[PDB]
Coordinates of C-alpha atoms in Angstrom, one line a residue:
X1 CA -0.3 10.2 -55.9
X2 CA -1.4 7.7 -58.1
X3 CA -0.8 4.4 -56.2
X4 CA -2.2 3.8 -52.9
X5 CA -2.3 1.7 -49.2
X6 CA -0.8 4.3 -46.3
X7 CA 2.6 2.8 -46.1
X8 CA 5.7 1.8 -48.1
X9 CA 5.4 -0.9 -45.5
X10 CA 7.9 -0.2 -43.0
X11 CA 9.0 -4.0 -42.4
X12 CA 11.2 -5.5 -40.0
X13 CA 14.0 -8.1 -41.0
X14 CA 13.9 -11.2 -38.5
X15 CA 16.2 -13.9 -38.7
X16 CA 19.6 -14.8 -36.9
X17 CA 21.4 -11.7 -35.6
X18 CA 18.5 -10.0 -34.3
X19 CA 19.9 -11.1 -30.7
X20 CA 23.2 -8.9 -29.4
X21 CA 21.8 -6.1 -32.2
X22 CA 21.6 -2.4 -31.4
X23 CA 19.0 -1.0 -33.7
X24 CA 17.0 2.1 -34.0
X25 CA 13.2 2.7 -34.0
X26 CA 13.3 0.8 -38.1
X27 CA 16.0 -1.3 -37.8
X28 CA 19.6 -0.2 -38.6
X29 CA 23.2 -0.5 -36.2
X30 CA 24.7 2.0 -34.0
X31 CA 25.5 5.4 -34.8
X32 CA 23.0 6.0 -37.8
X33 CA 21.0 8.8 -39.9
X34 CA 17.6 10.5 -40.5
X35 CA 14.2 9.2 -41.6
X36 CA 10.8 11.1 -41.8
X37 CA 6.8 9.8 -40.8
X38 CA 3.1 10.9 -41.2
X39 CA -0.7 9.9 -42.3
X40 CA 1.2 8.7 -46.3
X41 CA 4.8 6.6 -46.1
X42 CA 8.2 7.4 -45.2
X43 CA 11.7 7.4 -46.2
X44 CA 15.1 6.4 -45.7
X45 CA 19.2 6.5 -46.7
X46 CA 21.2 3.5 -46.1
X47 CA 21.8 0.6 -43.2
X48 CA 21.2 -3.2 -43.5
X49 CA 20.2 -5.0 -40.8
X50 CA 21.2 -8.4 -40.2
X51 CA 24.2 -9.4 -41.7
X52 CA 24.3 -10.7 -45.3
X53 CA 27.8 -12.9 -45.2
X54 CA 27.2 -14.0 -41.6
X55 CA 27.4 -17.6 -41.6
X56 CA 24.5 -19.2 -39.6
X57 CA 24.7 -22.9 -38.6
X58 CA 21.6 -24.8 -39.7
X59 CA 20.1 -27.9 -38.2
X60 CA 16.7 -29.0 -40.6
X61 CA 14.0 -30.0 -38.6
X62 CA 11.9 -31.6 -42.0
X63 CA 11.7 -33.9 -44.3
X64 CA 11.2 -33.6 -47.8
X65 CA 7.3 -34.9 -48.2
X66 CA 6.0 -33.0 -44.7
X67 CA 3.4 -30.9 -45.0
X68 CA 3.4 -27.3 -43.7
X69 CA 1.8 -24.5 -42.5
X70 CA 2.6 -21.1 -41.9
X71 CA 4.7 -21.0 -38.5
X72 CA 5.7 -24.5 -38.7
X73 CA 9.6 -24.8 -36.9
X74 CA 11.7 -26.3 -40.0
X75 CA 15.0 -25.7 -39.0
X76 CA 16.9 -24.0 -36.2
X77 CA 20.5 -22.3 -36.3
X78 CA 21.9 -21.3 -32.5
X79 CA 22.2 -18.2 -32.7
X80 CA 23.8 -17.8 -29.3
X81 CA 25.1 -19.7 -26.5
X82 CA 21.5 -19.0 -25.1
X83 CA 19.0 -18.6 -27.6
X84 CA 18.4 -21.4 -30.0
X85 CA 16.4 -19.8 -33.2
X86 CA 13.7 -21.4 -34.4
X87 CA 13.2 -20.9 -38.3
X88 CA 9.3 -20.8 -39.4
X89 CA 7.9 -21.1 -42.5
X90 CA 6.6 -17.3 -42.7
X91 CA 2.5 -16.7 -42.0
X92 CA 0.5 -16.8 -45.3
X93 CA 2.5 -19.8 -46.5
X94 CA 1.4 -23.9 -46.4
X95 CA 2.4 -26.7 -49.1
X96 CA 4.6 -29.5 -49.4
X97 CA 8.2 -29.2 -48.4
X98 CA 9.8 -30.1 -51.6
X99 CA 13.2 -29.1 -51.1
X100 CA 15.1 -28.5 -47.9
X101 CA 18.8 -27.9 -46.8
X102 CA 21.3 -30.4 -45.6
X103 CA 22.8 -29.6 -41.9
X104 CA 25.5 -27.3 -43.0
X105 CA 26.2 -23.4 -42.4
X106 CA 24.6 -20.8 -44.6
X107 CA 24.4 -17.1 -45.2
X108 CA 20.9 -15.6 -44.3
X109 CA 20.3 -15.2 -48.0
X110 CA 20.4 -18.5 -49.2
X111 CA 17.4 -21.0 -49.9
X112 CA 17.2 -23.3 -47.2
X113 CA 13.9 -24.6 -48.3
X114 CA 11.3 -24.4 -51.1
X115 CA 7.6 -25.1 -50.6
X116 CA 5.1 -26.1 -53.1
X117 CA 1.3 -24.4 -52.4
X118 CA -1.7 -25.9 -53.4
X119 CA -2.1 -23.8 -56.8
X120 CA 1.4 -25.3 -57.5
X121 CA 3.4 -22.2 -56.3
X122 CA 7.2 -23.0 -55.4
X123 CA 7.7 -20.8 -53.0
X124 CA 11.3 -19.9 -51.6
X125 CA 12.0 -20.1 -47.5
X126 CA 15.3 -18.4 -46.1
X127 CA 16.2 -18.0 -42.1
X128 CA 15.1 -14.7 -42.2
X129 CA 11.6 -13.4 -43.1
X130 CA 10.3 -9.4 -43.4
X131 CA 7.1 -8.5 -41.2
X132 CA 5.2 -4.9 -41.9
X133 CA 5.8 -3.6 -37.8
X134 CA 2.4 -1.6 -38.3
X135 CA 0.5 -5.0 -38.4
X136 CA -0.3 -7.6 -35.3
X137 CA 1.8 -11.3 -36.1
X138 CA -1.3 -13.5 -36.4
X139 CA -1.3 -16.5 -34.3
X140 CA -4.4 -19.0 -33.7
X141 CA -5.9 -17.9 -30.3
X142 CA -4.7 -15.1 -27.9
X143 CA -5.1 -17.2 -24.2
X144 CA -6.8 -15.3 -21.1
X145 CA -4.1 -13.9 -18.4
X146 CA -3.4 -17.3 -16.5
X147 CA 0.1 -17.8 -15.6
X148 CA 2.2 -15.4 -13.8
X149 CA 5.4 -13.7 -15.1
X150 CA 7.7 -14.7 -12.0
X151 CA 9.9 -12.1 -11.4
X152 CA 11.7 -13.1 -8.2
X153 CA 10.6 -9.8 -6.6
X154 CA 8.8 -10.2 -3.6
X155 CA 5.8 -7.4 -3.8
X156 CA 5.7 -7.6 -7.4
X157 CA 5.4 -12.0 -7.3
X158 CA 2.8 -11.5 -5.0
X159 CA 1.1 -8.3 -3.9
X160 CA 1.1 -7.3 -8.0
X161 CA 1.7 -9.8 -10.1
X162 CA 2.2 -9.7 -13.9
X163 CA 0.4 -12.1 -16.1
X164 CA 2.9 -13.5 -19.1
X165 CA 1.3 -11.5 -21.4
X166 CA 0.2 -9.3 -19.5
X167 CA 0.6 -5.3 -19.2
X168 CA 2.4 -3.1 -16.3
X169 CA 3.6 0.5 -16.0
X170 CA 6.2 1.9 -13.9
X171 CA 7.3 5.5 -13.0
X172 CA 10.4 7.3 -14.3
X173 CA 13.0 7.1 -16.9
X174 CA 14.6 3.4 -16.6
X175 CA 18.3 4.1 -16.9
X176 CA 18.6 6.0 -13.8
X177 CA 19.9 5.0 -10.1
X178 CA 16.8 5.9 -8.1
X179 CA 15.2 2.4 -8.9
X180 CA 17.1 -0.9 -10.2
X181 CA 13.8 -2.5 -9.9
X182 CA 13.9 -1.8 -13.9
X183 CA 17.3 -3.2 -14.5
X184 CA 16.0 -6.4 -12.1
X185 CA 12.8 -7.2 -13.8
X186 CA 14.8 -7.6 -17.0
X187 CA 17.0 -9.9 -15.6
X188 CA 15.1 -12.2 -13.3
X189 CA 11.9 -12.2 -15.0
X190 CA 10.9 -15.8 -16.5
X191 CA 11.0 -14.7 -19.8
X192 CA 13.8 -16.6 -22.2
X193 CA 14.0 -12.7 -24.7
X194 CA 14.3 -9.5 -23.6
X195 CA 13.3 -6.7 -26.1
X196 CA 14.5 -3.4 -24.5
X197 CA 13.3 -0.2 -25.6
X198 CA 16.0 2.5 -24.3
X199 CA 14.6 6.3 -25.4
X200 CA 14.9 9.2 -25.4
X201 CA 18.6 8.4 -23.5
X202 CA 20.6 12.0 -22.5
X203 CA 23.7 13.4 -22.9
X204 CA 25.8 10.0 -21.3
X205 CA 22.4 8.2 -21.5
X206 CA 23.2 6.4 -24.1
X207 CA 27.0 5.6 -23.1
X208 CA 25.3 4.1 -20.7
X209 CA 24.7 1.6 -22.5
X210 CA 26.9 0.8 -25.1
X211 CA 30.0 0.8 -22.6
X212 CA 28.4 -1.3 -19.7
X213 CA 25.3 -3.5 -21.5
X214 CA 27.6 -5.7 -23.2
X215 CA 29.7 -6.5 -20.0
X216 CA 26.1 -7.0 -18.0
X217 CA 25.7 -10.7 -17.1
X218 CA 22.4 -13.1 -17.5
X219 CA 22.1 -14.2 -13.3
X220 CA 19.7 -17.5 -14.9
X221 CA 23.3 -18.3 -17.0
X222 CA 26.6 -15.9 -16.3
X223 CA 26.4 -15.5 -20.3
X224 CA 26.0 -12.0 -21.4
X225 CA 22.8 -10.3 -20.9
X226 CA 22.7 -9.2 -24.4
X227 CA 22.8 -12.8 -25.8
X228 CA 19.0 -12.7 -25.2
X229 CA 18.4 -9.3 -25.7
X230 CA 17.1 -6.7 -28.7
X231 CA 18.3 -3.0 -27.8
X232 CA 16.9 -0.7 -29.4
X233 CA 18.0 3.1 -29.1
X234 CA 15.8 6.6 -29.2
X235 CA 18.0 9.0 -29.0
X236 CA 17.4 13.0 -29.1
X237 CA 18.9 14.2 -32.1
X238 CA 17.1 10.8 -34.5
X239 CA 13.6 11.8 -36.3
X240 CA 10.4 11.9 -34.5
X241 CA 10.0 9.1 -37.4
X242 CA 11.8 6.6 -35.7
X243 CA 10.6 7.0 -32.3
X244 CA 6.7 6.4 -33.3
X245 CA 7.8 3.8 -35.2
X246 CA 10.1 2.0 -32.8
X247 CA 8.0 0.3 -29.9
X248 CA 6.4 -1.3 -33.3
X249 CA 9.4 -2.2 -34.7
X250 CA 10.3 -3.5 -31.0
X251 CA 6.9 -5.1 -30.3
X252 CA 7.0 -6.8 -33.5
X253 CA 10.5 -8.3 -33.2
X254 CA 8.6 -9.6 -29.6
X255 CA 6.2 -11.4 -31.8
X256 CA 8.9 -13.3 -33.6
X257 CA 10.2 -14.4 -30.5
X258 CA 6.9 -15.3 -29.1
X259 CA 5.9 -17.3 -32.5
X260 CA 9.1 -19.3 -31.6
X261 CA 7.6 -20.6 -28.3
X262 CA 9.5 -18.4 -26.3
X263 CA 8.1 -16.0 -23.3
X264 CA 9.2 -12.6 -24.2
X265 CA 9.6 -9.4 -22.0
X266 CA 9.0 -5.7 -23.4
X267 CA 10.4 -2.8 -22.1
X268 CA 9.4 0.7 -23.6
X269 CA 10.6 3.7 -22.2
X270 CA 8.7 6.9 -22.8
X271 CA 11.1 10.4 -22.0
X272 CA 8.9 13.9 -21.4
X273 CA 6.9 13.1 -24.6
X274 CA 8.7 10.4 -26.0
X275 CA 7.5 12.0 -29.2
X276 CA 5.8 15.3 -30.1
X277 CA -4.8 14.3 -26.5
X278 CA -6.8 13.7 -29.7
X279 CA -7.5 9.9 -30.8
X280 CA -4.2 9.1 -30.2
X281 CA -5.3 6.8 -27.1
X282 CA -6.0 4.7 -30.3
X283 CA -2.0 4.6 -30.9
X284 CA -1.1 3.1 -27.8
X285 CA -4.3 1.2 -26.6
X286 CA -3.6 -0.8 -30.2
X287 CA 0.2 -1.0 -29.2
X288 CA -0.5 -2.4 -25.6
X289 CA -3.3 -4.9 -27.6
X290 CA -0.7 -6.5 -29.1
X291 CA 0.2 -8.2 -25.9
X292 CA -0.8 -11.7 -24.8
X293 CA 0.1 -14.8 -24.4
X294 CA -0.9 -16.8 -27.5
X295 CA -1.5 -20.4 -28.8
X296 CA 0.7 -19.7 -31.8
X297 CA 0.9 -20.3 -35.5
X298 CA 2.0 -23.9 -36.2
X299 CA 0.6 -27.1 -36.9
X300 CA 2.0 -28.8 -33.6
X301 CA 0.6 -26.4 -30.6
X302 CA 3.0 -24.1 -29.3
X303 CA 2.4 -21.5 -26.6
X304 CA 4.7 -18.0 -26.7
X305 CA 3.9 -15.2 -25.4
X306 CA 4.8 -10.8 -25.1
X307 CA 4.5 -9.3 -21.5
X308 CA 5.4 -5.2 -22.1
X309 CA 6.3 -3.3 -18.9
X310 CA 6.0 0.4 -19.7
X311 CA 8.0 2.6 -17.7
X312 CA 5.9 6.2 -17.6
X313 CA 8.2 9.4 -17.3
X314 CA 6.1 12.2 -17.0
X315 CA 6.4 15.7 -17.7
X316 CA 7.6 15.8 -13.6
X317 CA 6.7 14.9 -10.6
X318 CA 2.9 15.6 -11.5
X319 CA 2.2 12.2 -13.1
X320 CA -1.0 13.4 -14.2
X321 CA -0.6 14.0 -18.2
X322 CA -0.4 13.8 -20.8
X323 CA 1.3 10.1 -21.5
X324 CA 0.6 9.3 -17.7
X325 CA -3.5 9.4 -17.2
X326 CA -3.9 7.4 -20.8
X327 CA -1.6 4.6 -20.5
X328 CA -3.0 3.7 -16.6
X329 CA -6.3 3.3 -18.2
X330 CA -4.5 0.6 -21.0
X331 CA -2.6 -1.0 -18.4
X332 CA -3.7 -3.8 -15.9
X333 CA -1.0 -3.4 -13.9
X334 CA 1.0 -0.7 -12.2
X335 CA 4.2 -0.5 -9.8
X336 CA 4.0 3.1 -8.0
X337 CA 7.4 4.0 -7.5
X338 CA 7.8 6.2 -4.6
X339 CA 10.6 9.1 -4.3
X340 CA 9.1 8.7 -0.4
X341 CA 9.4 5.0 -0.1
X342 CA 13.0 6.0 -1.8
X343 CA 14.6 7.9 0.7
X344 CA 13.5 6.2 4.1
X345 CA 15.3 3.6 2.1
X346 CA 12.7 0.9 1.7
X347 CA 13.5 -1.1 -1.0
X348 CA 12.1 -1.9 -3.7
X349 CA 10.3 1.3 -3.3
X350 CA 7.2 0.0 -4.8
X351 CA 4.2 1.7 -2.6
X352 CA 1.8 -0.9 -1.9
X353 CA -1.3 1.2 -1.3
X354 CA -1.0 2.6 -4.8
X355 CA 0.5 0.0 -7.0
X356 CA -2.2 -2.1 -7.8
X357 CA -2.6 -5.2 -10.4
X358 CA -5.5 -6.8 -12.4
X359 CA -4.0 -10.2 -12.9
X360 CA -4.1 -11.4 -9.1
X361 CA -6.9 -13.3 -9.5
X362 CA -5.6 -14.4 -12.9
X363 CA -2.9 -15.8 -11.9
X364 CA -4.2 -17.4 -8.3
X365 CA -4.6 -20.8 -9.9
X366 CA -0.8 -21.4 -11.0
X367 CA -0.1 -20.5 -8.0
X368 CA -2.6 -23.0 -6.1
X369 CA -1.8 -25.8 -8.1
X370 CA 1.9 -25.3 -8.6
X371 CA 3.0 -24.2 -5.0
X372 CA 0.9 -23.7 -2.0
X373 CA -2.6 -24.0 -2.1
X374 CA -2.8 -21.3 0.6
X375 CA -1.3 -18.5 -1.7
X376 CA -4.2 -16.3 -2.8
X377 CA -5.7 -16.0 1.4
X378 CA -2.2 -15.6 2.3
X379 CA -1.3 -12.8 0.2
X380 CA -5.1 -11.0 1.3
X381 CA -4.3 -11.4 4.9
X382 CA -1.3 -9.5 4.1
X383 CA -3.1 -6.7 2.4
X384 CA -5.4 -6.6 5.0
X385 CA -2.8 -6.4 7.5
X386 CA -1.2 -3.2 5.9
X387 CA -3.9 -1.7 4.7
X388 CA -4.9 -1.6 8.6
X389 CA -1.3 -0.4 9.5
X390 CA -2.1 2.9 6.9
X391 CA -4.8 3.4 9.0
X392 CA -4.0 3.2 12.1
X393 CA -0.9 5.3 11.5
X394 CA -2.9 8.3 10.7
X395 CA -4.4 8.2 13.7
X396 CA -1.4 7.5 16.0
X397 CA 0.0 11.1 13.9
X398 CA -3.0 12.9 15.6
X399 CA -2.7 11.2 18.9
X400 CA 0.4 9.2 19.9
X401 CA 1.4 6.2 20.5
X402 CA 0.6 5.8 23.9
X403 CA -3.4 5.9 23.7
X404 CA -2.9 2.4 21.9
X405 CA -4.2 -0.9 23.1
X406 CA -2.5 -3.9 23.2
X407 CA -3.8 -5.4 19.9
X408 CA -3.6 -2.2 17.8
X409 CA 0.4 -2.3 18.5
X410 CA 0.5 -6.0 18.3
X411 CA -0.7 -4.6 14.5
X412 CA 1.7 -2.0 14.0
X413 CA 4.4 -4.6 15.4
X414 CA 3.7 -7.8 12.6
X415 CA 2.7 -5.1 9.8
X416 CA 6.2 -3.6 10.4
X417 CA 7.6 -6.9 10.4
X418 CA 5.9 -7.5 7.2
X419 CA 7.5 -4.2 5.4
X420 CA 10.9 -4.6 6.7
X421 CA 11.2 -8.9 6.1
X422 CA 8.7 -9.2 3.2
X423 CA 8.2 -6.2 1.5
X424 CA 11.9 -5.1 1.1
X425 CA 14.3 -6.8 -0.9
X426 CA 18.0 -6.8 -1.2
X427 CA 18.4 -6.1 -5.5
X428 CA 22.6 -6.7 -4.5
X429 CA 22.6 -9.5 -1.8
X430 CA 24.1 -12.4 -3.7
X431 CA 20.6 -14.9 -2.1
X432 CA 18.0 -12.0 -2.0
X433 CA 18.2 -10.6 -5.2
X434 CA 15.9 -12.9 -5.9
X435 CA 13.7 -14.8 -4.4
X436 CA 11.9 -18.2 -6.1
X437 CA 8.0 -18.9 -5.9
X438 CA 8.6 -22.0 -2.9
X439 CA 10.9 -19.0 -1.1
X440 CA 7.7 -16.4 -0.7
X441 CA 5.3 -18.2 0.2
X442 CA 7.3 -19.5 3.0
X443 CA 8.3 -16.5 4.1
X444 CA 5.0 -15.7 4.0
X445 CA 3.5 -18.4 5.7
X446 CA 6.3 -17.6 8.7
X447 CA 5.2 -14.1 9.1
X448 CA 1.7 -14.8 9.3
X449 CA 1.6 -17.7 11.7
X450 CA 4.0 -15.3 14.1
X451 CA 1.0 -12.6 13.3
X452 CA -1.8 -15.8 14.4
X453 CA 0.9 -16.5 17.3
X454 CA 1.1 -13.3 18.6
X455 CA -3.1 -11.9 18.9
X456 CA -3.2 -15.4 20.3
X457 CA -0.6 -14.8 22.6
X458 CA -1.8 -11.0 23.3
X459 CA -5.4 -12.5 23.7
X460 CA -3.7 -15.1 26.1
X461 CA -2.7 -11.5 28.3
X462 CA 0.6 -11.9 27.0
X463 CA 2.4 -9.0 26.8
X464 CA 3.5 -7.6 23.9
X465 CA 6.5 -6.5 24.8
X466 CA 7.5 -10.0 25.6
X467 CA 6.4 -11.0 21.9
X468 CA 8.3 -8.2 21.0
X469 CA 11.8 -9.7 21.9
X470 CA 11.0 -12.7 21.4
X471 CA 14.0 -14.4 19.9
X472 CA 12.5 -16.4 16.8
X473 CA 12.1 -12.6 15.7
X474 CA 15.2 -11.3 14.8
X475 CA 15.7 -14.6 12.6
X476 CA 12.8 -13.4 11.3
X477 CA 14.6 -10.5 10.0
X478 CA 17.3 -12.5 8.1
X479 CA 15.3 -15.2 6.2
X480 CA 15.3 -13.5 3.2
X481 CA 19.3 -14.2 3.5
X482 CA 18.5 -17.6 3.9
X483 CA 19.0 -19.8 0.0
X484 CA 17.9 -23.1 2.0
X485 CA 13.9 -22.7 2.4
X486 CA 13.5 -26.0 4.3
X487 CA 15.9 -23.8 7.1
X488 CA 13.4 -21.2 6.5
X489 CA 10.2 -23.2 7.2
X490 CA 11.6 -24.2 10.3
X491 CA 10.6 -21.1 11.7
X492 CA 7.0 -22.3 11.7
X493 CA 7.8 -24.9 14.9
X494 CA 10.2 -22.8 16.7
X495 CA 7.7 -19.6 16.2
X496 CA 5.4 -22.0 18.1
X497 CA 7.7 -23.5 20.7
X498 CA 9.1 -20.2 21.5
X499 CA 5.3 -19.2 22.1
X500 CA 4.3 -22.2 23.9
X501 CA 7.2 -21.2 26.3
X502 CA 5.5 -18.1 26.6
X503 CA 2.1 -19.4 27.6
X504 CA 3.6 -20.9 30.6
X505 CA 6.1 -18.3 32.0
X506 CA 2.4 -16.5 32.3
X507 CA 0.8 -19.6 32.7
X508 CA -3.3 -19.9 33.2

């Protein structure tokens, strides 16, 4: 063993044809053959990876004269009717652009620009570019969780919110029907690339996929899904070797997309050991450290950034280890799927005593600045009001209903109103299946003045079950059907008038 360095240096290709692609944990289409890993190198058979007589519409973005850096945007080819790609000069290289293409289409082989480095060095620029997957993309400065991830979903926006760049885990294998939650973060999530990691896929787990991906529309565009998306595929009879590799190879083609400018979302998608502790906490703590949002290469300052979602399929029902206790200690945020939550049918069936999420405070100042100052209060008054509701419920088990005070079933009545009208979402009403940043906290603001409304109104000796019927109520219900939000915040006055009306019929 002569030579040396642990690695033939598994790269990555990325370039134009990356998005639509099907790959496996290294980078080869569909329906492909058998590599092998360890502590030394690797090998392989045969694949390509992005295609060599594909021509690629080029746009150049410089000058010959302009000076360069590594990650500077020189060109860009549309790759689809989403995704514009942005061709960088690759990291490692500055100089003088001393050559450069003339808005025409090309093959990804082909010199579309030469640059000359200080020593003197031509050096030779294509759209595409190779990248070792076992090594982080540099970038200039990796920027503290800040601005939310906005993912339309209710509980997740604002009871657990995901930082862009950020990192959450989530029960279960993702392609399954017991939870769409999955399927509806990809799609809604502000992210313009989706890099999914489909593994370990079963038996019809993977036709799945190929049959129904590609007829799966983007909501944000009716243009396929896939024309923003990376699949790659970890299928049982592949090598362990490509299934260690892959969330690399996957995180890495993130990068790229990230070094563009772009937010990306990561989906990994672990399948009872999604290969066969010790210190391999190491192995994922390093892969979930290569998330972030990032001020990235490039001499003009560019933000992009790589939020993973890791969905955590345990050896069953146990979620206790192996995978499962190391990856909650990674992870800043988690979304505790509940089988229980499931079948009463609350849905998303995200438990909110057990979810939790490190970003809140984070992310509080987008949120301030951007769309309601009262945000951050409003979303702890809401905690506060379930987190009593868990309480008193265990009591009312042990004693009934009946031993209850006014204002402990004025509780149970708004936090009940807050589970079935905030926390629970419609994934497959045409309005609700998602719900914008001015929609929730408007909802919210209209469930929580009827909460101040009603102790007022109890305190008043109101009774509750007057509140109870109250009309305004069962609108209440339906907001979340409601696409106008102005009709929505209307709720606030008639809440009130409705009240007021209340007050006198009692009078005093």
């Amino acid at each position: 063993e002569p030579v040396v360095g642990t690695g033939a240096s598994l790269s990555v290709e990325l370039g134009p044809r990356l998005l639509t692609s099907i790959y496996d944990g290294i980078q080869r289409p569909l329906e492909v053959i058998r590599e092998k890993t360890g502590d030394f190198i690797a090998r392989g058979v045969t694949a390509p990876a992005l295609p060599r007589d594909k021509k690629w519409h080029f746009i150049p973005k410089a000058k010959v004269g302009d000076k360069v850096v590594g990650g500077d945007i020189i060109g860009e080819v549309p790759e689809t009717s989403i995704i514009v790609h942005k061709i960088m000069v690759p990291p490692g290289i500055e100089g003088e652009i001393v050559e450069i293409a003339e808005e025409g289409d090309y093959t990804i082989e082909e010199v579309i620009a030469k640059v000359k480095t200080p020593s003197g060095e031509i050096k030779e620029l294509k759209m595409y570019q190779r990248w070792p997957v076992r090594v982080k993309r540099p970038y200039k400065e990796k920027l503290p969780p800040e601005v939310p991830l906005i993912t339309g979903q209710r509980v997740i926006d604002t009871f657990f919110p995901q930082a862009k760049g950020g990192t959450a885990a989530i029960p279960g294998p993702f392609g399954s029907g017991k939870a769409v939650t999955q399927h509806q973060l990809a799609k809604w999530s502000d992210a313009q690339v989706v890099i999914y990691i489909g593994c370990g896929e079963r038996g019809n787990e993977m036709t799945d996929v190929l049959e129904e991906f590609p007829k799966l529309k983007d909501p944000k565009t009716g243009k396929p899904l896939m024309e923003r998306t990376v699949l790659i595929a970890n299928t049982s009879n592949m090598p362990v070797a490509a299934r260690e590799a892959s969330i690399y190879t996957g995180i890495t083609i993130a990068e790229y997309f990230r070094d563009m400018g772009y937010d990306v979302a990561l989906m990994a998608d672990s399948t009872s050991r999604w290969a066969e502790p010790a210190y391999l906490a190491s192995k994922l703590a390093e892969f979930y450290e290569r998330a972030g949002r990032v001020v990235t290469l490039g001499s003009d300052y560019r933000v992009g950034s790589v939020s993973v979602i890791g969905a955590v399929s345990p050896p069953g029902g146990d979620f206790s280890e192996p995978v499962v206790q190391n990856t909650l200690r990674v992870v800043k945020v988690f979304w505790a799927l509940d089988a229980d939550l499931a079948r009463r049918r609350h849905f998303p069936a995200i438990n909110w005593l057990t979810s939790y999420s490190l970003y809140v405070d984070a992310v509080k100042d987008w949120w301030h600045k951007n769309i309601d100052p009262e945000w951050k209060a409003m979303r702890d008054k809401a905690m506060a009001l379930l987190q009593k509701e868990s309480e008193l419920q265990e009591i009312v088990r042990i004693v009934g209903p009946d031993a209850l005070p006014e204002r402990e079933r004025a509780i149970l009545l708004v936090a009940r109103m807050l589970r079935e009208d905030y926390l629970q979402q419609d994934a497959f009403d045409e309005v609700d299946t998602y719900c914008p940043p001015e929609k929730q906290v408007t909802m919210m603001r209209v469930l929580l003045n009827f909460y101040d409304k009603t102790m007022e109104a109890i305190n008043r000796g109101v009774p509750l079950e007057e509140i109870a019927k109250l009309p305004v109520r069962e609108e209440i219900g339906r907001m979340k059907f409601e696409r106008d939000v102005s009709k929505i915040r209307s709720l606030i006055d008639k809440t009130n008038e409705q009240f007021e009306e209340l007050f006198k019929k009692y009078g005093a």
